[PDB]
């Protein structure tokens, strides 16, 4: 009747964007950056080795002071670390062991975690008593939780496996917004530098930049073959690198609206579990499942380092707010802290 | 420093509680509970007693954790690796769904959908050496159905005989033939009783045999 003409009307808007995209694809960025300096063999060394998790580490996140960090692990523990002296500031017991994400609040007052129980639990660090206790639990998701990210002390955004992201108000404890555009499970978030947008990659190999105050998908980014496992934002705020089970990672752009650089290698047939950018946005760091975190020179598409100290797959990694350290927690139950020497 | 010596002294109070909790959680038996849906999973939880439903049913000096991922309408390949170190996997299959069709698309009648899932759980690369416990759930209901209709709508290559104890030579052996890793697993099989002993005693007896053969692979003798 008309549903198969709207099958044609749907692709009528898709091929129009195709010719608008390769027209503004006037030059590949690698032939402009033929003249820039390759950074050389980035060599880092495990300065600290944070040990005390007893199962797979599924997520970690740094505090904003670049010194405290939280790590989540499959043994149902959330540990606050002093990365300077490897000594544990807090260990938080979780209500469900199956935890796939964790976040640190930008004030450091709060830490979130969530996972297969479809709840982002919010924990209060700086109590007038001595303990860390649960502020609010955020129920309302249908699939598992993949990534919690605080905007401030009262607003957190969570992605889930029900194809929906969601903005929350932690005070009332209920989602002010809900972001429904994806068709597969959303697997990772990263908030913007100015925290007025975010972007989420899903199991349908698509990425979608959102608006936290409007509530709808600004742009939609394709280019991957298999599921997207890892988003982080570039420090500019106008790029983000997706890390896939396709054994590839690609760099995007919101103002250009297509993939620009893809970071792969033919000896790498193993899928990316984590992505993070450096302070200059010159070292994409990515944690693979050939057991070693690779360190990608993000401007040139040639791997410039490897943090090969891990006995199982590298599930999480984060560069600090001053670019000084890098942790790579992993499935061998250790976080290792990497800083390159002169 | 003085205060830095009381922060170090605190972190090894944290450390000896992450060690005390983690040697009380290696003495626990973790068990995935999979299945086809309406396949008697809800029955055996009521015997052995919104996302994960971790059921803990510690009964004979051995602490069990059973994780029912039932309402996880999402891609299974994206969260199944969390259960990699798991002792066994309890799998339910409805015997009465032999000639009973599935309600999806009138495909192969609701046990080739169970057998499609069993082949995806046996040969899964996280379950290379996690031996699956198999339950055959609706034993009473298909005997009244095997007298009315033969076991040819599901398996047309069967022998016949229309008998209650015949279908073990049809149904159980068909599922244990899907075990492509015949040397690293075992597919311990059962017929779900309606008594309190012989459906959770089997879960205790056949999970000790996972533990014994996990020690022999740890102590070199295997």
């Amino acid at each position: 009747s008309e549903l198969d003409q709207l099958r044609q009307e749907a692709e009528q808007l898709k091929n129009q964007i195709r010719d608008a995209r390769k027209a503004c694809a006037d030059a590949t960025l690698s032939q402009i950056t033929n003249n820039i300096d390759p950074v050389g063999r980035i060599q880092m060394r495990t300065r600290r080795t944070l040990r005390g998790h007893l199962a797979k580490i599924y997520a970690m996140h740094w505090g904003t002071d670049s010194r405290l960090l939280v790590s989540a692990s499959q043994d149902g523990k959330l540990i606050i670390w002093d990365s300077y002296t490897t000594n544990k500031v807090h260990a938080i017991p979780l209500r469900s062991s199956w935890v796939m994400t964790c976040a640190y609040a930008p004030s450091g007052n709060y830490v979130a975690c969530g996972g297969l129980d479809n709840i982002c639990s919010i924990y209060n660090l700086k109590t007038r008593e001595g303990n860390v206790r649960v502020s609010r639990e955020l129920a309302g998701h249908t699939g598992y939780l993949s990534c919690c990210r605080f905007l401030d002390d009262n607003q957190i955004v969570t992605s889930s496996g029900d194809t929906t992201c969601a903005l929350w108000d932690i005070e009332t404890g209920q989602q002010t917004t809900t972001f429904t555009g994806h068709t597969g499970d959303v697997m990772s978030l990263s908030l913007a530098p100015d925290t007025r947008l975010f972007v989420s990659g899903a199991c349908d190999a698509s990425a979608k930049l959102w608006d936290v105050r409007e509530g709808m998908c600004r742009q939609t980014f394709t280019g991957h073959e298999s599921d997207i496992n890892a988003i982080c934002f570039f420090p500019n705020g106008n790029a983000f690198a997706t890390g896939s089970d396709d054994a590839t990672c690609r760099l995007f752009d919101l103002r250009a609206d297509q993939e620009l650089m893809t970071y792969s290698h033919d000896n790498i047939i193993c899928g990316i579990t984590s992505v993070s950018f450096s302070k200059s946005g010159r070292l994409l760091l990515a944690g693979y499942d050939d057991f070693n975190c690779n360190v990608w020179d993000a401007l040139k598409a040639d791997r410039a380092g490897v943090l090969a100290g891990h006995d199982n797959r590298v599930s999480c990694l984060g560069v600090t707010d001053d670019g000084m350290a890098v942790a790579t927690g992993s499935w061998d139950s250790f976080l290792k802290i990497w800083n390159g020497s002169s | 420093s003085a205060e830095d010596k009381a922060a170090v002294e605190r972190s090894k109070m944290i450390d000896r509680n992450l060690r005390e909790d983690g040697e009380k959680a290696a003495r626990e038996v973790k068990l995935l509970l999979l299945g086809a849906g309406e396949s008697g999973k809800n029955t055996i939880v009521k015997q052995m007693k919104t996302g994960i439903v971790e059921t803990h049913f510690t009964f004979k000096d051995l602490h069990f954790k059973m994780f029912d991922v039932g309402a996880q309408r999402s891609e299974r390949k994206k969260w199944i690796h969390c259960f990699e170190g798991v002792t066994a996997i309890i799998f339910c299959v409805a015997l009465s769904d032999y000639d009973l069709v599935l309600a999806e698309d009138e495909e192969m009648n609701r046990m080739h959908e169970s057998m499609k899932l069993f082949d995806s759980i046996c040969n899964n690369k996280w379950f290379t050496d996690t031996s699956i416990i198999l339950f055959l759930n609706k034993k009473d209901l298909f005997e009244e159905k095997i007298k009315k209709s033969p076991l040819t709508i599901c398996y047309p290559e069967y022998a016949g005989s229309n008998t209650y104890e015949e279908a073990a030579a049809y149904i159980q052996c068909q599922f244990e033939d899907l075990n492509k890793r015949k040397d690293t697993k075992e597919i311990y099989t059962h017929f779900t009783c309606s008594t309190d002993t012989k459906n959770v005693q089997f879960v205790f007896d056949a999970v000790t045999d996972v533990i014994i053969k996990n020690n022999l692979k740890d102590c070199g003798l295997f």
Partner: single-chain antibody
Amino acid sequence: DVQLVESGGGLVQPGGSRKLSCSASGFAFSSFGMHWVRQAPEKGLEWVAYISSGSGTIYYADTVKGRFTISRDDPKNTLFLQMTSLRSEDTAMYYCVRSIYYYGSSPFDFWGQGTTLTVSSSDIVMTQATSSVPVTPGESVSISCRSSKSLLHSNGNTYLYWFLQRPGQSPQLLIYRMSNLASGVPDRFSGSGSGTAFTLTISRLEAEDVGVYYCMQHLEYPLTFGAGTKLEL
């Protein structure tokens, strides 16, 4: 909220014994280090003892070390001090101080109301050479004291602590580790300094900011106090 209240003592003959207990309620007492601090009549404060959280590290005051005994019991949530062979310098009001040490905590913040004990008959020095200052509400006050050793440590902080004891009240942490304001203090107070000389500033005086303003160190034990700096109205 948080509440420490201690018992035991008041009048004892000299050469005797006394058991001071401190009942804690409102916080996670098994996760806190616990001090005792005394204050003799019309004198300053003087640190008495210490237990680390988990009873691993016990210090004492080198004045009466080996005479006193500090103990805690976490399932009871009390803090004990056994004081035996009691002299005449032991006459003081004894306070129960709460203190927690991790990265970024505020030690020495909650002080109990106290109990009194009367009878009938090297290390760093903190010097507040000013004894009292006449001051009118509204102006900027600046209190200063001196140390013997440099209080700055090689890890980066400066263990100088400030406290205000209002008249008829208990001490109250204002600034911990030379700069950082405590919880619930008004923003008018501020702390500063460099190395061995420090300056506590108030910007606006109010009627409850009168009292005696002490300065403590915490760089190594003993936690030596100084004589106080009075502000009267």
